[PDB]
Amino acid sequence: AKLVCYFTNWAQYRQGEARFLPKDLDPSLCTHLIYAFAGMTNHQLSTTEWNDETLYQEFNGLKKMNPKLKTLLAIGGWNFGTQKFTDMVATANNRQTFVNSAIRFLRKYSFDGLDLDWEYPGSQGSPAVDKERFTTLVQDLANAFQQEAQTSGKERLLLSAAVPAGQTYVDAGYEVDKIAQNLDFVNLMAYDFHGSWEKVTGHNSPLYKRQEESGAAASLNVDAAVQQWLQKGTPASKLILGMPTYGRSFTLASSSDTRVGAPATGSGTPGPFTKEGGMLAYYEVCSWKGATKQRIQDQKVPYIFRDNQWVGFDDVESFKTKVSYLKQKGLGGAMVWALDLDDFAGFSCNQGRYPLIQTLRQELSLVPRGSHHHHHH
């Protein structure tokens, strides 16, 4: 099994106990660590934060403590836009520029691979031709990584992609069966299914549909997303199920209707550390005083409300349920967004350090046999 965990290079700017740096990383928690995010300049891989080079050394230096660990660098992300990807894949020359830059950059900074996080080919302003061009990019990278391994004698660079769960995006951008052959693994973003862009409450990451749902809404859940990627041609062993250590919040129209599907007037109040309305870290919901926790019985995930605030999130129990699910489907492991949104320092939830991600590690049977300081949940 794999446990693929994302580090974010902006978590270093959170205040107080929520501040997160590579030293807060446990080298033995995950099997693969992915660094979010790199960018692109003149079709070449580039840093995005003033101290990335410092952080890259600390991050990849974790492999000194755990030589089994693999690291990857993720390019793009949800605020990166599409134009730089579109322009880079538009010609063979630009793709070659990018591919060669990626090899040099990853080797220079001691990363073991590249994770593609374009949101998304064929959508959000990207033209329809980018669906086939993304396929070509993935093929170009895979082929070049193979060649560089042969010529250099070094372990081949890994290639992964973070891919959407929603059918609209999948069909506009992803030749699933073709790309799956060339990717080492596929990081399924099985979250952001619902949120405050909608006028009623709904869960960030439900495992199954609600009985009431129909039409396209009935596929906005983890099981449907997994089945979609499998049926469209992803080998189960390559499909890595995303898991959120955050929730999505709503302001309710009335504190007297707290159901899933109740009317909402907008995003929930921002959290005290993450400061982004509509989102909360697990550590910002796990210890919410005077709140009422509930479970959505069809969907196998919790929500919590207090006054006119409603949050759908994941807890230890829902992570256990989702790992049981992924094992039943024969998937390659779990992926987690993100290290810095779990209670990484044990400062909030009274569940020790990394309670959610340790739950994933346990349930995947990835606990080191040498480990002394782990906590079973």
Ligand SMILES: CN(CCc1ccc(Br)cc1)C1CCN(c2nc(N)n[nH]2)CC1
């Ligand atoms: C917009 N989503 C939520 C990000 C987010 C989570 C929690 C908080 Br607090 C503030 C912001 C992202 C979309 C991209 N996702 C992603 N997953 C992977 N593997 N690559 N990119 C992670 C969730």
